[PDB]
Ligand binder design. Structure first.
Ligand code: NA
Lengths: 133, 132
DNA sequence: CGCGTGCG
DNA sequence: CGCGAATGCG
């Protein structure tokens, strides 16, 4: 049931809350299409939410037909609701990750996109291609 | 275990939310010591909350040694916490019970009192004497 | 660590 | 109907 001609995102975390990075890779080859530099403090869910919206922006910029895959049931919901329901405090330490979540929410509120967001079923398909471990 | 020399309070409720009233009775004699005309819209829990605090002001004014009995676990805890955790919407129609509950909370925030608040154990001792 | 079913 | 407390993957 898996669509190989597609985009897979995943978040690497050094603690949660902790340092967060993410990347988007080709599901078939493994080529890294985009990647973002580690953020000092955020949650895993905030990272997945940014990773999805970033892949959405990358695919729309390119008029792609690739679905986007994520293994985070929570962040897919957040993206579809256009609202990231994170509990993380809002201080100077967390201001970068929150600025990026706010602008991603703003992009979802002002843009259409035809890329379907698909669940990656790990228990069935193995690690998502973009896994960091 | 039952302190017969005490006060019992209870809420009369037609619907919840709905019209709620309450009264304090002497546990032994049944004699009605205070009584609240029906409020148009309230919850039982808020009615109970008010009935306990009414008992406490009633009992403090007369320097009584009576405990207060209530069979509502929720409202007994709300009084101890000085906070009535009702989910009733605040609107014109519910302005009155919220006024009374806000004022009942403010009384608890500002007053000491010595009468203990005890759980009436309906399963072991039958009906609370203030039952409508 | 982060997230979404006794009685008055 | 209103209320209080617990108890699955990245
Ligand atoms: Na009662």
């Amino acid at each position: 049931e898996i669509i190989w001609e597609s985009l897979s995102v995943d978040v690497g975390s050094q603690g949660n809350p902790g340092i967060v990075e993410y990347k988007g890779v080709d599901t078939k080859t493994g080529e890294v299409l985009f990647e973002r530099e580690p953020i000092p403090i955020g949650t895993n869910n905030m990272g997945e939410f940014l990773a999805i919206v970033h892949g959405l922006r990358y695919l729309k910029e390119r008029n792609s037909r690739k679905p986007i895959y994520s293994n985070s049931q929570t962040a897919i919901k957040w993206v579809k609701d256009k609202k990231a329901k994170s509990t993380l405090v809002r201080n100077e330490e967390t201001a970068l990750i929150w600025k990026l979540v706010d602008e991603a929410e703003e992009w979802l509120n002002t843009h259409t996109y035809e890329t379907p967001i698909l669940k990656w079923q790990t228990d069935k398909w193995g690690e998502i291609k973009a896994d960091y471990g």
